[PDB]
Amino acid sequence: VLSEGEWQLVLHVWAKVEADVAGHGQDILIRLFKSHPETLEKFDRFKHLKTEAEMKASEDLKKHGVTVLTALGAILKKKGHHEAELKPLAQSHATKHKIPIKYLEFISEAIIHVLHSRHPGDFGADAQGAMNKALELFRKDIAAKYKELGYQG
Numbered sequence: 839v840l841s842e843g844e845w846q847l848v849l850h851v852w853a854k855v856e857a858d859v860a861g862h863g864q865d866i867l868i869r870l871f872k873s874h875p876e877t878l879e880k881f882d883r884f885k886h887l888k889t890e891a892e893m894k895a896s897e898d899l900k901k902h903g904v905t906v907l908t909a910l911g912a913i914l915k916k917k918g919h920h921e922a923e924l925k926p927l928a929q930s931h932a933t934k935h936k937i938p939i940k941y942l943e944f945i946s947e948a949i950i951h952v953l954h955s956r957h958p959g960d961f962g963a964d965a966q967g968a969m970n971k972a973l974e975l976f977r978k979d980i981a982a983k984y985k986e987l988g989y990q991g
């Protein structure tokens with residue numbers, strides 16, 4: 839289900855992301871919070887931000903965007919061989935933050951939306967299919983770790 843060619847498509851669009859990690863991460867989180875506002879409830883100090891301009895001007899939200907894309911990039915670059923990177927993320931998101939897999943689906947949809955909006959010429963059907971499979975693998979593997987930790991979300 840991911841060939842080496844599909845991993846190259848994932849990593850090619852990822853290189854485009856890496857031209858501006860902060861701006862992509864801001865836009866991904868803003869998209870997630872506008873599409874699925876219940877996710878904001880997990881963030882004590884984004885949940886009171888009243889407007890898109892306030893979210894874009896928040897240095898903390900920008901830093902979070904970088905933290906999320908740095909961890910995800912490190913995972914994608916392993917082309918599936920991501921146990922050591924993914925295990926601690928599962929641990930925190932299951933046991934501390936309590937993030938259900940459906941919220942990982944929502945942020946995956948936000949990732950695809952922003953990548954396509956910013957890079958349509960590098961993110962056609964085949965590259966989208968490859969990224970969807972890579973994100974599905976990430977979510978499948980995190981869900982298995984969730985269960986191993988006793989969290990069934």
Ligand code: HEM
Pocket residue numbers: 877878880881905906907909910926927930931935937941942945
């Ligand atoms: C691609 C998916 C995601 C990645 C790679 C990611 C990555 C991270 C990283 C690296 C951290 C800091 C270290 C840690 O606590 O593990 C973190 C913190 C956290 N994440 Fe995620 N995350 C993802 C999705 C989500 C989603 C969808 C939510 C909420 C709807 C969420 C909620 C949180 C919370 C509440 C924290 C703690 C924030 C703080 O205390 O500053 N995460 N995440």
